[PDB]
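A reminder before we start the practical. When you read a complex entry, don't treat the lines as separate problems. The point of joint prediction is that each chain is placed relative to the others, so the output describes one connected object in space. Small molecules and nucleic acid strands, if listed, are placed in the same frame. In the example below there are two entries. Take a minute to note the order of the lines before looking further.
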Amino acid sequence: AKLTSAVPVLTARDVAEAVEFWTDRLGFSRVFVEDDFAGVVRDDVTLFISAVQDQVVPDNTQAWVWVRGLDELYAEWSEVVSTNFRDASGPAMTEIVEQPWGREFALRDPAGNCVHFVAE
Amino acid sequence: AKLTSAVPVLTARDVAEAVEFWTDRLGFSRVFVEDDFAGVVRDDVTLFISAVQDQVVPDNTQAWVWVRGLDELYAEWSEVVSTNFRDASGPAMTEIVEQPWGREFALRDPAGNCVHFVAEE
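Here is the predicted structure of the whole assembly.
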């Protein structure tokens, strides 16, 4: 057997809100959308979004995504999402930082998920 | 820019126990292990594992993994993982089921993460 690819599952109290953000704000498309569960895709990467009732879940939910052209992606998203990660109430993103494991930025979505985008 | 691949993050109260399960039980290899965060890999799929305080989080954490040779993978893991999914006192897996979107089994790890393995079409 061969494991070929993987799909992170983001969590949200409000899945509809999360879907609108990921598609309309960040440029993903809908794979499917239900009240309790949805999927969005951009390029080779699919993310699922699952309903929860406890905010602790999204506040502890994370995913990593590999990117060719991290600067370009940051340039796109930094226009439509706050770059004040600590102070913004809405979704926000960090700057690109050179971490020991790689160059990346983190984005916090409206549900509270923390998704890291790392240069490949 | 191009989004090329993704890495799910499983959660655990005990990251070391989670790493031991995914490697010794399920045949993933260690990528890196820290006290509060770890990475394991099999074939083209990496999973991260992150420490959390509350059991509610792993009990609500999921991931999906695409597989070529789902029956073989299931056969392998059935050698060492319970197939009584409804007993939540230990890790276990469902049978392979034909869902509307694909053929898949689900595996619940010791921490409580539910990871679905779906056959490629």
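Discuss with your neighbour: The domain at 1-121 of chain B is CATH 3.10.180.10 (2,3-Dihydroxybiphenyl 1,2-Dioxygenase; domain 1). What might explain this?
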